[PDB]
């Protein structure tokens, strides 16, 4: 089954207003990696730029103390608010949906691969309102995930940029 297909995308999703910088606040997921290495999370930043009906997305975060930039392309699936991170070899495709968001303070995104749903909360800046945090946890519960499957990411140590030697391009096939 596809849990993400039951998720309603942000009505009349406007990529123009969604563009810019987003700070990753938390992830709700049953992923084994997070359960075992979640307490090792790095401050993560997302930078979005509309590319037609698709969205170019760069993710910034440190690896071994060094700032990296990952370049991806959220492809247009034909449905407003729904995007596709195409599969690459044995790497399965990742479906994405921008659900709740006011474009100006927070965004709730869902990601799905192999039928497993993951939920992410982003914020334009910190601190995040109690209302948004509680709202996000409510969505995590509705996604059949427990409180022990919620991981809050660092609030400091973010990367503003990366040099040419630390840019991972996952756009060019």
């Amino acid at each position: 089954a596809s849990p993400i297909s039951t998720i309603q995308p942000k009505a009349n999703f406007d990529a123009q207003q969604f563009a810019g910088t987003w700070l990753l606040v938390a992830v709700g997921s049953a992923a084994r990696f997070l359960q075992e290495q979640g307490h090792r999370a790095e401050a993560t930043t997302l930078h979005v730029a509309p590319q037609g009906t698709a969205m170019a997305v760069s993710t910034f975060r440190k690896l071994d103390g060094i700032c990296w930039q990952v370049r991806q392309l959220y492809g247009d699936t034909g449905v407003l608010g729904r995007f596709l991170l195409q599969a690459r070899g044995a790497r399965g495709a990742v479906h994405v949906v921008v659900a709740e968001t006011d474009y100006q303070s927070f965004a709730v995104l869902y990601l799905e691969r192999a039928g497993q749903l993951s939920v992410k909360l982003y914020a334009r800046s910190l601190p995040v309102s109690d209302s948004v945090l509680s709202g996000f946890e409510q969505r995590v519960q509705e996604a059949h995930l427990t409180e022990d499957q919620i991981f809050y990411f660092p609030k400091y140590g973010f990367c503003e940029a990366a040099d040419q030697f630390h840019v991972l391009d996952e756009v060019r096939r």
Partner: peptide
Amino acid sequence: LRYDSTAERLY
């Protein structure tokens, strides 16, 4: 190097 966005994993 690869990035799994579902688990915020860089490996």
